[PDB]
RNA sequence: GCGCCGUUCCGAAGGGACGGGCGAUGGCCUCCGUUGCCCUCAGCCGAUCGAAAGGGAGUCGGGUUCAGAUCCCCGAAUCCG
RNA sequence: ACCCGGUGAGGCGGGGGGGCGAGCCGGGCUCUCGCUUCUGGCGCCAAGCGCCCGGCCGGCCGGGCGCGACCCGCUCCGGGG
């Protein structure tokens with residue numbers, strides 16, 4: 001059956017021995033300057049000692065809670081531009097013959113109904129690009145007593161409202177069919193954020209060295225530990 | 234003849250009919266053949282002594 | 291509104307939050323070129339005070355001047 | 359009163375180097391994996407005279423480790439190097455002459 | 459997917475064609491180098507008449523922006539005659555002179571008597 | 577500030593080609609090209625300028641003008657596409 | 658941060674795996690190695706293996722993917738700071 005013409009011809013990829021194969025080299029690319037910049041921006045957020053008012057946005061409401069919050073917030077989306085025109089045609093027909101609750105959106109409206117205590121829950125995006133827009137807002141929700149959470153995505157918090165991004169999203173009113181589910185969110189979110197807030201205020205961030213540098217420090221410390229522990233016996 | 238006149242010439246005007254013909258001389262071709270043979274035969278001999286060094290050890 | 295909070299937060303430039311932000315942004319701006327376009331204001335509040343409206347046709351460039 | 363001559367030399371334009379018939383920057387081979395871990399062979403192609411230099415240079419031709427392409431180098435010839443001599447370069451190379 | 463190279467080249471984007479929403483100029487410019495604009499007049503010089511009578515050519519004075527191809531097409535169209543070759547020189551006066559050799563089934567003296575020069 | 581420095585230096589500096597695939601028009605719609613999209617392949621070196629003495633394929637003989645001829649005319653060629 | 662050097666920013670740092678040495682009872686451990694030194698030769702655009710898929714009549718002809726070519730990472734590696 002087999003053919004003796006078919007030969008197994010191996011290549012010896014040793015030093016100086018045979019030419020190197022086109023293997024994966026993403027780690028050694030000369031990247032453009034914008035890529036190089038946006039990577040070591042994140043590296044600096046890991047290196048530098050990040051203050052706790054910026055560090056608190058790294059704590060994000062987890063996945064199984066985020067699904068329940070976005071499920072409840074899909075019930076109360078603002079009307080789309082087409083649905084605005086449809087309701088205006090409906091009231092036009094009624095003229096020719098109580099408004100439902102929505103989500104409030106933006107830092108300005110959400111802060112003004114945090115001080116007025118009209119908010120029942122405040123969702124905060126974690127990646128708002130000048131962070132100074134929302135740095136105060138967890139502490140203000142703490143003072144006014146409003147439950148605040150932090151989600152991953154200004155992008156996907158900008159998809160409840162029909163836009164690109166959105167900084168914050170509040171709950172002012174909900175319906176009686178969807179009232180106890182908001183309470184079940186408010187309990188977990190309140191005990192995860194508001195009740196645990198002094199620990200948030202003191203929690204400095206970052207200040208982690210490189211894995212190569214951590215490995216070199218670890219090699220020195222484990223060598224000192226071994227060379228001190230082998231002497232006692 | 235001048236290098237752009239080499240467009241005008243026929244093929245056999247510009248080489249000799251041998252391996253590396255018209256690019257390399259005959260003496261260096263035959264020593265390059267001998268070298269290419271004897272280096273590889275020495276590599277076979279080193280391979281065999283490697284296998285026998287596996288045999289004694 | 292949020293803008294009075296951002297205003298008095300940017301008056302506190304000696305604080306830890308704001309020293310952190312000015313240091314990280316100043317690094318990031320030094321990595322770019324001497325004249326380039328910001329796609330949006332860095333300080334939305336200050337831009338609004340100074341005349342800017344967030345509509346089509348208002349443009350913001352971030353440019354550096356060598357110092358002294 | 360005038361700008362003196364030693365000040366004038368730094369502006370150039372008459373006091374620049376005469377680099378017309380020079381051959382190249384006589385450099386070692388760049389660092390790569392073979393230099394750093396093993397060694398790599400190259401033969402001395404010819405030994406050449408550079409103008410404005412008492413040292414003779416040496417076209418040393420290496421085989422590129424990643425591409426099918428021969429790389430050629432201008433070393434500075436150590437004394438006793440001849441043409442058709444294999445020149446090694448790397449961490450594991452031997453300690454003889456003209457061998458970096 | 460893998461990066462073979464240590465380099466990042468700029469990736470090749472799609473780019474379209476001009477599909478303009480109005481033409482810039484309203485109509486194209488007319489050719490102002492006609493067949494009539496490009497042959498001003500023949501030469502009636504005794505040297506030019508010697509050339510006509512012997513060497514079977516016609517010595518014209520031509521616009522300075524003309525090719526030998528354009529002079530050949532203009533002589534072919536204005537006087538209905540085919541041309542072997544055109545030799546051009548520009549005078550120190552500034553005019554371009556064309557020596558229009560004819561294909562030998564035509565007499566230069568007959569076409570010179572046709573156009574008037576004798 | 578008009579601008580200046582700098583010329584490979586802090587650049588996402590490639591608009592190209594062999595093959596495979598998708599379609600679209602044109603010719604006895606045979607087979608081939610014209611494209612448009614996808615996969616693949618791709619180094620170079622810095623845009624451009626800079627020698628009528630440097631590099632640079634290929635035209636010679638005879639006759640002709642008052643004044644032009646390796647240029648016109650006759651005869652022999654030759655290079656490139 | 659900032660500075661310098663190299664390069665076509667090409668195998669950096671941990672960890673597995675493999676072999677070769679020393680010490681205890683086939684086994685856990687520390688460390689070293691990782692494939693080229695007799696010659697003025699050649700060396701790329703994968704062989705082999707494993708699993709899928711498509712057109713024709715078990716055979717035929719064109720394809721795909723993974724190993725081969727270890728995994729993971731946050732600075733391209735180095736030298737200063």
Ligand SMILES: [Mg+2]
Pocket residue numbers: 245246247248249250
């Ligand atoms: Mg021959």
Ligand SMILES: [Mg+2]
Pocket residue numbers: none
């Ligand atoms: Mg030029």
Ligand SMILES: [Mg+2]
Pocket residue numbers: 627
């Ligand atoms: Mg010239």
Ligand SMILES: [Mg+2]
Pocket residue numbers: none
């Ligand atoms: Mg010349």
